[PDB]
């Protein structure tokens, strides 16, 4: 099990959850926040949520991973 904090992302309406250790780089484009996350198997994934959908508590975490 992971001992890190997980971040929930509203992927096109779906509720996804990525561990903070899997988050590679987050890039806020303004209203839309895009992020790259490492999944496994050599390949990774990506997503983009809105400022309104992303909770402040998690949004601040995204600020720390803002690369």
């Amino acid at each position: 099990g992971s001992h890190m904090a997980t971040v929930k992302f509203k992927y096109k309406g779906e509720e996804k959850q990525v561990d903070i250790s899997k988050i590679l780089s987050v890039g806020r484009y303004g209203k839309l926040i895009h992020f790259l996350y490492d999944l496994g198997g050599g390949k990774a994934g990506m997503g983009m949520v809105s400022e309104k959908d992303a909770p402040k508590e998690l949004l601040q975490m995204l600020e720390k991973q803002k690369k």
Binding site: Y11, K12, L39, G41, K43, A44, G45, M46, G47
Partner: peptide, 10 residues
């Protein structure tokens, strides 16, 4: 297999 894509109209 893994590797999704978004598509939001900015």
């Amino acid at each position: 297999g893994e590797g999704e894509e978004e598509g939001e109209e900015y």
